């Protein structure tokens, strides 16, 4: 139960204008207050929310400049009324002092002069930060409610809760004595802390933060407050601080609107002796701020295509007159312990704080048998697992420089590895990388450019072998390499390590030995996947010459090969890839979405359009040839049926390939055209119908049509080992 034991559990949101803090006091619930980031030099002796009203403290901190080392300061809303004020390394003293004060004030509320604070802040490295706060500090009150009290604060460890996970806790949980549940959100959502200086827009798909679309803007309440105050003065033809104007004139009226939905607000301010009714001068600024945010919020909604939009902060309370319109539109979630909206961030850090504080055959029992189709976009690999059949996946040929330390078919959707190969060069020879779709969501990405390069191809290949080895539960495998059309495939013999710094194989170190190799240069093995399959053992495929042609339909190009007597001949490749067809489908879908209400695109990348929208329907179509597909796209709040646009692009692609296919059959006159690659699955809607006329053969299993090239290389590898 109770960790105290002298522990102050708190969440701390330090910004440029206020220092918000949420802490467990004596009772077990949550208390919260804010100290403006303001400090003013003070004489060494004296000269509800009563505490922050007057903060005159002397701080003896070893995290301090020495200069402010042990000297007196005015802190907070009291420092505001000084003219040696300081307002936002340089100068850090401005942040650390009002923070230590809040801890002292918090500790004093629970009646302790020595408290140990596991620091749970947030960044608006990161052991880099906590070492700035570590050690023990003393805060002596020279005045105020705790006049003469000396609070001693020891900071041990902590979390910076930049992890993103913690930023959404205050909407799912609450602390009342014992921890409560308020999951009704989606797996993807936007969080918008509406601040006084800045509007912070964050987006979270899956579990955590998508910092490609995440932004910080200058849409704060200050500018609007500043103009309201100005016009008030122009009507008197004051309030000294912005905050003063909020707590006195504004904060009352807002809550009456909260206590009661039909309440008419009334802003009147007396100056000196005169009472002027400024009920509309305030309302305009309030409603105008409201408008700009809904504009801003909706733009970010279409940008992220989030399923839920959470709106928190004090900007909600300030613009509540116009922002209460959001309770009616779904996609938008206020937390409706709504007075607590301002401290939503600090509450989140408090909950998270609390949480961590709670603490024939073959035999192959160390050989990795794989066929490798390493390309310009995907590093496709087909390998044998324990059970003895073929598993296949593809790793996006994209890498990104990574920190050497931590900070189905989805063990590869967190690939953080270090590659130690003799085949690497630069200082890549000894450094960590983000591999696969994750140098996608990183701006230090490197992607193939039309050499070195080279590291760009070797790393996803070695990682693919890793994932394979780690999958069959071996902490290292001998790999007979089977690639495809003098080498420097001995970049690749010798031996290679890959160590998982994260992901499903956290801490697993996978070290790879390559000693043999074949290129399957002849084309005869490039077609092996349609005559054979490996199910536990090796079998001939259910229903199958002198010569045959092959059409691999890729993303970038459609390649044509011709084999006679099995042997490779007349081979060409057209840039008749799926990419331009997909791009103009996406182009068309987006433009059917451009009316009545509609910032970029509903789908994040080309892969996103396929993995989510397309290949589900294709699977229903493969399993059932009478099934009508239904392609529907949701973008923000808009749900439109784009079945036409997707089917049209598929069918045009189907004909264009058929047009190209028939031509290549004419010049080579092969007995058999085999159509393979991923383009088969994309244009399957029309290629399943045109298959019966032109007279060519598609492979079954057809779901694995993409890995056909890598599959054939695997069989050639297996056949090889059988001598």
Ligand X SMILES: Nc1ncnc2c1ncn2[C@@H]1O[C@H](COP(=O)(O)OP(=O)(O)O)[C@@H](O)[C@H]1O
Q: Which of residues 36 and 677 has its CB atom nearest to Mg ion in the complex? A: 677
User: Which residue lies nearer to ligand X by CB, 18 or 471?
Assistant: 18
The upper half-sphere exposure of residue 646, i.e. CA atoms within 13 Å in the direction of its Cβ, equals: 20
Q: Which is nearer to Mg ion, 159 or 348 (CB)?
A: 348
Residue 679 binds what, of ligand X, Mg ion, none (CB under 5 to 8 Å, by partner type)?
ligand X
As a whole number of angstroms, the distance between CA 177 and CA 24 comes to 9
SS3 of 322, please? helix
Residue 251 touches ligand X, criterion: CB under 6 A: yes
380-399 positions binding ligand X, by CB under 6 A: 380
Residue 516 Cβ vs ligand X, minimum distance, rounded to whole Å: 25
Residues in region 668-687 near Mg ion by CB under 5 A? 677
Q: Which residue reads 């059917």 in tokens? A: 592
What x-and-dash track marks residues 702-721 binding ligand X by CB under 6 A?
----x---------------
What is d(CA 276, CA 238) in angstroms, rounded to the nearest whole number?
12
**Least CB distance to ligand X at residue 678 (A):** 2
Query: Which is closer to Mg ion, CB of 436 or CB of 677?
Result: 677
Among positions 669-688, residues that touch ligand X (CB under 6 A) are: 677-679, 681-682
The nearer residue to ligand X, 218 or 443, going by C-beta atoms, is: 218
Regarding 350 and contact with ligand X (CB under 6 A), the answer is no
520 to 559, contacts with ligand X by CB under 6 A?
A: 554-556
Distances (CA, A) of 476 to 34, 368, 462, 469, 514: 55, 9, 12, 6, 11
Phi and psi at residue 175, to the nearest 5°: -110, 110
Cβ-Cβ contacts under 8 Å for 588 (sequence gap 6 or more): 645, 649
Contact 214, 205 (CB under 8 A): no
Of 73-81, 242-250, 412-420, 530-538: span binding ligand X (CB under 6 A): 242-250
In 460-602, DSSP assigns E strands to 481-482, 494-500, 509-514, 517-518, 532-535, 537-540, 547-553, 558-564, 567-568, 572-574
Q: Is 503 a residue that touches Mg ion (CB under 5 A)?
A: no
x/- binding map, residues 344-383, to Mg ion, per CB under 5 A?
Answer: -x--------------------------------------
Contact 672, 548 (CB under 8 A): yes
By CB under 6 A, tell whether 285 contacts ligand X.
no
The three-class DSSP label of residue 173 is strand
Cis amide leading into 578 (omega within 30): no
Residues 436-465 as x/- pattern, contact with ligand X by CB under 6 A:
------------------------------
Among 554, 577, 602, 699, binds Mg ion (CB under 5 A): 554
CA distances from 292 to 319, 326, 490, 526 (A): 10, 13, 60, 59
What does the alpha-carbon distance between residue 637 and residue 298 come to, in Å, rounded to a whole number? Answer: 9
Q: What is the token pair recorded at 699? A: 């492979």
Closest to Mg ion by CB, 19 vs 228, is 19
Smallest CA-to-CA distance from 711 within 552, 534, 582 is with 534
313 binds ligand X (CB under 6 A): yes
Beta carbon of residue 709, minimum distance to ligand X (angstroms, whole number): 7
| Contact call for residue 18 and ligand X (CB under 6 A) | yes
* Residue 195 makes contact with Mg ion by CB under 5 A: yes
Q: 269 or 610: whose CB is closer to ligand X? A: 610
Element (H, E) at 309: strand 308-313
Please tell me whether residue 22 binds ligand X under the rule CB under 6 A: no
Q: Which of 110, 615, 638, 697 binds ligand X (CB under 6 A)?
A: 615
* Residue among 13, 143, 32 at smallest CA distance from 78: 143
Evaluate whether 239 touches 245 at the Cβ level (below 8 Å).
yes
Tokens of 153: 């604060």
Rule CB under 6 A: is residue 610 a binding residue for ligand X? yes
Out of Mg ion, ligand X, none, what residue 317 binds, judged by CB under 5 to 8 A for its kind, is ligand X
Q: Does 315 bind Mg ion (CB under 5 A)?
A: no
Q: Binds 455, which of ligand X, Mg ion, none (CB < 5 to 8 A, cut-off by type)?
A: none
Question: Following CA atoms 68, 70, 72, 75 in sequence, which dihedral angle do they give, to the nearest 10 degrees?
Answer: 60
Q: Which residues bind ligand X (CB under 6 A)?
A: 15, 17-18, 20, 194-196, 221, 243, 246, 250-251, 254, 313-315, 317-318, 342, 375, 377-378, 380, 554-556, 578, 610, 614-615, 618, 677-679, 681-682, 706
Q: Which residues bind Mg ion (CB under 5 A)?
A: 193, 195, 345, 554, 677
């Amino acid at each position: 139960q109770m960790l105290s034991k002298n522990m102050l559990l708190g969440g701390f949101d330090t910004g440029n204008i206020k220092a918000k803090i949420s802490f467990l006091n004596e009772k077990g619930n949550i208390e919260s207050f804010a100290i403006p980031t303001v400090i003013a030099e003070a004489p060494p002796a004296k000269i509800k929310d009563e505490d922050i009203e007057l903060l005159h403290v002397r701080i003896i901190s070893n995290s301090l400049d020495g200069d402010a080392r042990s000297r007196a300061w005015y802190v907070g809303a009291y420092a505001k009324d000084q003219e040696d004020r300081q307002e936002p390394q340089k100068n850090k003293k401005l942040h650390l002092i009002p923070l230590f004060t809040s801890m002292a004030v918090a500790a004093a509320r629970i009646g302790k002069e020595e408290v140990s604070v596991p620091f749970s802040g947030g960044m608006p490295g990161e052991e880099q930060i906590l070492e700035m706060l570590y050690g023990e500090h003393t805060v002596e009150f020279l005045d105020g409610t705790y006049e003469g009290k000396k609070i001693k604060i020891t900071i041990n460890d902590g979390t910076m809760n930049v992890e993103g996970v913690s930023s959404v806790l205050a909407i799912l949980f609450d602390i009342v004595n014992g921890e409560i549940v308020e999951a009704e959100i989606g797996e993807s959502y936007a969080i918008n802390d509406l601040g006084a200086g800045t509007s912070d827009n964050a987006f979270f798909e899956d579990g955590e933060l998508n910092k490609k679309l995440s932004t910080n803007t200058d849409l704060g309440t200050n500018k609007y407050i500043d103009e309201i105050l100005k016009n008030i003065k122009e009507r008197f033809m004051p309030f000294k601080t912005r905050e003063d104007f909020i707590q006195r004139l504004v904060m009352p009226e807002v809550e009456k609107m909260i206590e009661d939905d039909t309440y008419k607000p009334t802003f009147s301010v007396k100056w000196g002796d005169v009472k002027e009714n400024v009920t509309d001068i305030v309302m305009d600024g309030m409603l105008k701020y409201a408008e700009d945010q809904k504009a801003s919020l909706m733009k970010f909604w279409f940008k992220t295509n989030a399923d839920k939009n959470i709106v928190v902060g004090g900007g909600v309370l300030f613009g509540y007159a116009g922002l209460r319109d959001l309770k009616e539109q779904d996609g938008f979630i206020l937390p409706k312990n709504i007075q607590e909206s301002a401290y939503f961030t600090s509450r989140s850090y408090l909950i998270a704080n609390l949480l961590e504080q709670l603490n024939e055959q073959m035999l192959s029992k160390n050989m990795l048998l794989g066929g490798f189709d390493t390309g310009n976009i995907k590093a496709k690999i087909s390998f044998l697992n324990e059970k003895g059949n073929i598993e296949s996946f593809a790793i996006p040929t994209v890498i990104a420089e990574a920190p050497p330390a931590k900070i189905k078919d989805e063990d590869i959707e967190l690939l953080h590895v270090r590659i130690i190969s003799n085949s690497l060069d630069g200082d890549a020879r000894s450094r960590a990388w983000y591999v696969g779709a994750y140098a996608k969501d990183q701006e230090d990405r490197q992607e193939p450019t039309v050499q070195k390069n080279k590291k760009l191809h070797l790393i996803p290949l070695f990682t693919s072998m890793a994932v394979a080895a780690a999958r069959i539960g071996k902490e290292e495998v001998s790999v007979p390499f089977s690639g495809g059309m003098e080498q420097i495939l001995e970049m690749l013999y010798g031996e290679h390590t890959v160590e998982f710094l994260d992901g499903t194989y956290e801490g697993k170190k996978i070290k790879i030995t390559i000693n043999d190799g074949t290129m399957n240069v002849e084309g005869v093995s490039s077609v092996l996947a349609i005559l054979f399959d490996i199910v536990n053992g090796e079998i001939v495929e259910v229903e199958g010459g002198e010569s045959y042609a092959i059409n691999d339909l890729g993303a970038g190009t459609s390649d044509n090969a011709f084999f006679e007597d099995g042997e490779l001949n007349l081979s060409t490749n057209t840039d008749l890839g799926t990419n331009k067809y997909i791009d103009e489908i996406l182009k068309n879908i987006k433009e059917r979405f451009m009316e009545n209400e509609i910032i970029e695109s509903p789908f994040k990348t080309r892969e996103d359009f396929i993995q989510r929208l397309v290949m589900p329907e294709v699977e229903k179509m493969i399993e059932d040839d009478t099934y009508k597909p239904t392609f529907s796209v949701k973008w923000g709040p808009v749900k439109e049926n784009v079945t036409d646009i997707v089917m049209d692009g598929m069918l045009k692609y189907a004909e264009d390939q058929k047009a190209s296919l028939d031509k290549f059959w004419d010049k080579t006159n092969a007995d058999k055209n085999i159509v393979v690659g991923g383009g088969v699955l994309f244009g399957y809607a029309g290629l399943r119908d045109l298959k019966e006329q032109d007279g060519f053969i598609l492979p079954k299993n057809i779901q694995e049509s993409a890995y056909f090239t890598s599959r054939s290389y695997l069989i050639a590898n297996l056949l090889e080992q059988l001598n």
